[PDB]
Amino acid sequence: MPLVYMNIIMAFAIALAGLLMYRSHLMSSLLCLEGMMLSLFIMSTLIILNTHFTLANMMPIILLVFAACEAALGLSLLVMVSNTYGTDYVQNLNLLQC
Amino acid sequence: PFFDVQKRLGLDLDRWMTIQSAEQPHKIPGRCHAFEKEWIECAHGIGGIRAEKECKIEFDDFVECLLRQKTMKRLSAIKRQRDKLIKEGKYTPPPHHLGKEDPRP
Amino acid sequence: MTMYIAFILSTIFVIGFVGFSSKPSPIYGGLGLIVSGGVGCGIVLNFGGSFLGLMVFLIYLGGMLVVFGYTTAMATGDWVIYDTGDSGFFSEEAMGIAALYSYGTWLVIVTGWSLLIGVVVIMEITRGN
Amino acid sequence: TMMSGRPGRVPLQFLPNEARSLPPPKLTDPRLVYMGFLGYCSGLIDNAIRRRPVVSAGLHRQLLYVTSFVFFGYYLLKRQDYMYALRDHDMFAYVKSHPEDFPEKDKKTYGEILEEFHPVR
Amino acid sequence: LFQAEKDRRVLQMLRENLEEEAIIMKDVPDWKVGESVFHTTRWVTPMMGELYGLRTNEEILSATYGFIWYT
Amino acid sequence: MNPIIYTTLIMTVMSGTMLVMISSHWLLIWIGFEMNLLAMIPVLMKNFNPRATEAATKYFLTQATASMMLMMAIIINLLYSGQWTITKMFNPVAMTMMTMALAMKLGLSPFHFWVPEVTQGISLQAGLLLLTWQKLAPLSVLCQISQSINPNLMLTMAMLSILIGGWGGLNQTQLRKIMAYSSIAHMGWMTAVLPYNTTMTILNLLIYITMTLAMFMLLIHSSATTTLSLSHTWNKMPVITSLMMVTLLSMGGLPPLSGFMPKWMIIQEMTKNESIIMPTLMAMTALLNLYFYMRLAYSSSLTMFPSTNNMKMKWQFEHTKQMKLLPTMIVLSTLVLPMTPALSSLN
Amino acid sequence: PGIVELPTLEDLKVQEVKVSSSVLKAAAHHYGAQCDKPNKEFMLCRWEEKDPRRCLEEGKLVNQCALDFFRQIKRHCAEPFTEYWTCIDYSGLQLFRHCRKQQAKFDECVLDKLGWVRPDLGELSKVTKVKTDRPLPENPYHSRARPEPNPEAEGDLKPAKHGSRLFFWTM
Amino acid sequence: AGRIASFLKNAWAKEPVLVASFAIGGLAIILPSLSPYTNYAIRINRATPYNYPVPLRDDGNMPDVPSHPQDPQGPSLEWLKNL
Amino acid sequence: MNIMLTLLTNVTLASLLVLIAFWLPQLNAYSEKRLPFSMKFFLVAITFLLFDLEIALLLPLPWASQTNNLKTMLTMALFLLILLAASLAYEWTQKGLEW
């Protein structure tokens, strides 16, 4: 396992950790999710190209498409949340408590 | 759980994309076609458990083809020893490895 | 060996992810993600994935991050693991990708249905009331 | 015993053909009677929920409930008996094919076995 | 003809690398010169680092990135 | 929304689950999960209010993170073995990340935090769908890759789920949070037998789904979301309160009720594998679930709470919409213990 | 796990073809028409043996055949071939279509001199048969012995002894 | 009969773009199934050699397989030349 | 290499010429003296994103035309375009393209 794959997985772990920190700005949560899918795309593309799995060249595009669709949904949700409060701050969603 | 509709109906919804050695377009081979072919043939019908204990040789060869850890380790050892001898001064690479060879078609 | 250019590319990618993972001033986070996406596209293109790299650079950068920034604006080592032979008179990447219409009928069906449902879901969610 | 991977198994077959060699459950089987009783209880609770005379609101509805319960119970009992028959057949075949793992114990009489005696005091 | 030339060139490069390994590894105690890393005796297509591992940097760059970088 | 749109979205959710269940390719499983995620969001927001929007966005965030972890596990598995078929996981912690993604999808501890919030935010029908149908696909995947799981991690998360559900249900006055913690504890019971017998997992899933359907339909019929709001049901529909109390006793695992069948079997199975301490601890912890079920039963039908004057008008009207399957669900969740050996049908 | 065998540097010595890709493309059609038999033997052996080391002689044979073909061209049709391959070399794509005139000159010259007829469209891509005495490799993949399959039990189904036998149920 | 013609005439006015688009899309859906040249296109795709034709080992029982490209037996491309 | 050199040259020339434009008039001394969040503009961007995704799906068409399975690829391409048209029509009839 070369160092490039390790760097990509480290990048994904950093994006996931930053998503889990939640300083503020749920928009940053969506940004972290998109960084995660970008790292997934890059490493999956590198693995597939390297092993010459010709039919697997389908998979990255599919992934991209689906992930981007998810982003759209998320953005819509964000707007409505903002549409209630005027700002996308995380701490505004304190109505529901365990 | 898993409802094997494809086998019941003979549809082949996604089995064409599962392995490297399954009818690539224009007969383009995978990098590890032979190793995967050998490992699959060895483990067919044996089952996963007996397959895991008994087809270990073919799976190890397949993994070595896929990731090539042993090959890079051997190459790195050779290069490290070559660097040691070239810093000590008892080894000189031939012109072939210096760019002074006669290239062939 | 150009000092392992892929290594520098990966390190810059990780540096960019660290840079906007602190999430400072979400437009600066988005610009860091733009730089990181450019670096990753460069990685894929240098590897040899021209079409998939261009898909990244077009779809990801020009649509998704653009819409992200638009909505935000509304608000406040190597060279060893490679091959030996050639590909023929075509690129294997293009053939495998174009196989989606001849081999991947099921993939096309499910992706198209998912995208249509995504459009419908977006309309219903953004209806408001 | 995970029998999902059993060789020669049709994926979505509720009752395989070889199950037809087993005796079907009798129509007076106690489990079938219990399934009919469950259907009758379902009918009574249905009458009670909708605020109807519990015993004598809908005779057709209660009859339909009982009949459907009996039908499903009969088929379920068939599948149950078939699966248990498969388990026993597999166990017996494995015991037959692996003699070294199931040795014949030497028959020993209590007159020649020494068991420790603990008085009750 | 191209296939024959390719096979001959690859084999000749592998022979040169084997000779250099035999010369270099003469003092390493447990080394066996030209030992396969695979259990199978089937021929395995060599990697790019198996042919160009001991060669100079410029032709390594050529063999690795020349086609990608040719515009 | 438009009834046609609602029907289409429900069919899309079910089609995503079926695509997960019938496919043998990891990418198709991920696509089915994506389809289910996409079609589920509007269902949680049928009644538009800030609470439902908050619940939907929390659910979307959790499920998207779970999907990303699932894809990373799939890609690492492909890297260490060029396989796309759903089989033995072939690798170290790639399996750990797969298990974490499936646990977040299911709501197992320590990823349980979103279930009570999403259940409280959404209505009762959305909560019914969320707590019943959304468990089939991840459990199917876990049953498929059960021989790969490390028993230590799975058993740890199962015991954590049981403990957290038991403790968190004690503090709730809202009925939806009670149902969410019950779901967490039941999933904990389900996943502790996956390393040993997947048939027991499926049996527990069937029994739990039946009990949850009966409970949610009873809660919808007597439209109460609070303990005191439920305490007013006896003055109109005492038979509903009696059926609810019987169902709550069944969910507590009391013999001879139906809810005793799974735990019993599970305990039995775990004793075949030389495991005693965990079954003992699981029973003693499910005692807490029983305690808060019994408190709800006290407040529901065993005592008569004060009523209000306007209640008299409700005496003059009858429910226009009637749930057909409610009677059957109650009987199946109450009186199916004697039919226990039917679990050989590999349900 | 074993020592890989490689042929000596002496076994890989052959009189090499030192003509550029333009010359090869200009001569390719007649080369495939005339040198078909050694080329087909080499490619059949190459696809059947799956080993470069087992097909070394055939490479020398195909090199010799190419050298003989070019020697005949040089003796009989050197000049028109020179203009033809120069024209082919000028183009950046090395297209045949720009100087059909030089191709016609070269083709008529070779037809008059050596009686060479140019293959038609779609002929060099045919799948042809090769008459060779080289033995068919019995185990080209060096496969081991496949493990024995499961005992595949068979028999007649009977009712389970004493029912399900789960706890207290008698059926 | 009359209602359909009236609807098309009303759509051809004040909505010509949609009428043209629907007509073009319907024609694109329908025409390929009726044309005789789609099989010609499939055959043309079949005759494009992207790979090396691997020769077959002769055993004396393949009268249909040529030994040389100039042999008469084997697939021909005269029809493509005629096109 | 050549593409990297070309991009570097373009960026460097643009940067240098912008800097000289921004600094030439800075050597001589002179005086040196909200919320609304329209919702339609968000729908435009979301629709663009979805249609761009479907275009990404449509992109491999030039190579898809040489597969020997022409009927299947034609069916799938027409299916994709039909669903793109259906998405457009659904968003049209739901008053999603209004101002």
Ligand SMILES: CCCCCCCCCCCCCCCCCC(=O)OC[C@H](COP(=O)([O-])OCC(O)COP(=O)([O-])OC[C@@H](COC(=O)CCCCCCCCCCCCCCCCC)OC(=O)CCCCCCCCCCCCCCCCC)OC(=O)CCCCCCCCCCCCCCCCC
């Ligand atoms: C061990 C196995 C063997 C035994 C099996 C045990 C289970 C069997 C039955 C299962 C369920 C089916 C029936 C239940 C439906 C409910 C309907 C109801 O309430 O009854 C009203 C109805 C009479 O009232 P009505 O005039 O119709 O109208 C009044 C309204 O209905 C209602 O009037 P109201 O609303 O004004 O009154 C209010 C009242 C009314 O509320 C209720 O009564 C609710 C009903 C109980 C809940 C049922 C839950 C589901 C079943 C679970 C069973 C648990 C068993 C396990 C052990 C745990 C014990 C909890 O509620 C309250 O007072 C609130 C507080 C209640 C106190 C605490 C609650 C505890 C209840 C638990 C009962 C468990 C045993 C039930 C036995 C049957 C009871 C009817 O009763 C009946 O007439 C039906 C009884 C059965 C019919 C028998 C006919 C057969 C005879 C002819 C055939 C011969 C047979 C042999 C053949 C060969 C011979 C020749």
Ligand SMILES: CCCCCCCCCCCCCCCCC[C@@H](O)O[C@H](CO[C@H](O)CCCCCCCCCCCCCCC)COP(=O)(O)OCC[N+](C)(C)C
């Ligand atoms: C909670 C009480 C249980 C009630 C459950 C609902 C009852 C209504 C269901 C109506 C009929 C459903 C049957 C479906 C028709 C055909 C099914 C067939 O095609 O599937 C077979 C399988 O059949 C079904 O699984 C059997 C379902 C029967 C469930 C009954 C068991 C209930 C547990 C005991 C409690 C007693 C309940 C009695 C009252 C109903 C093949 O399965 P297979 O592709 O090879 O492997 C997948 C399953 N694996 C992975 C677990 C091995």
Ligand SMILES: CCCCCCCCCCCCCCCCC[C@@H](O)O[C@H](CO[C@H](O)CCCCCCCCCCCCCCC)COP(=O)(O)OCC[N+](C)(C)C
């Ligand atoms: C049988 C079940 C029918 C009812 C249940 C429907 C379940 C959900 C609906 C989706 C299932 C539709 C079946 C499609 C499965 C794909 C495989 C099958 O179709 O064969 C293909 C045949 O392709 C056909 O053209 C498929 C055309 C059907 C798809 C067009 C419309 C699909 C719409 C279905 C629902 C989508 C959303 C709703 C729209 C209204 C493969 O082509 P083929 O050439 O053999 O092999 C290629 C491999 N080669 C290259 C090696 C040779």
Ligand SMILES: CCCCCCCC/C=C\CCCCCCCC(=O)O[C@H](COC(=O)CCCCCCC/C=C/CCCCCCCC)COP(=O)(O)OCCN
């Ligand atoms: C399955 C076939 C698909 C292939 C062809 C289509 C491909 C692309 C075309 C469709 C793209 C999406 C179109 C969306 C349609 C929406 C229609 C709509 O709702 O708009 C109505 C108007 O639409 C209509 O008029 C209803 C239907 C009109 C006719 C539509 C075509 C029906 C058939 C006509 C041609 C038939 C075949 C061709 C033969 C013609 C002779 C050659 C209102 O217009 P407004 O803009 O809101 O005006 C308000 C401001 N004044």
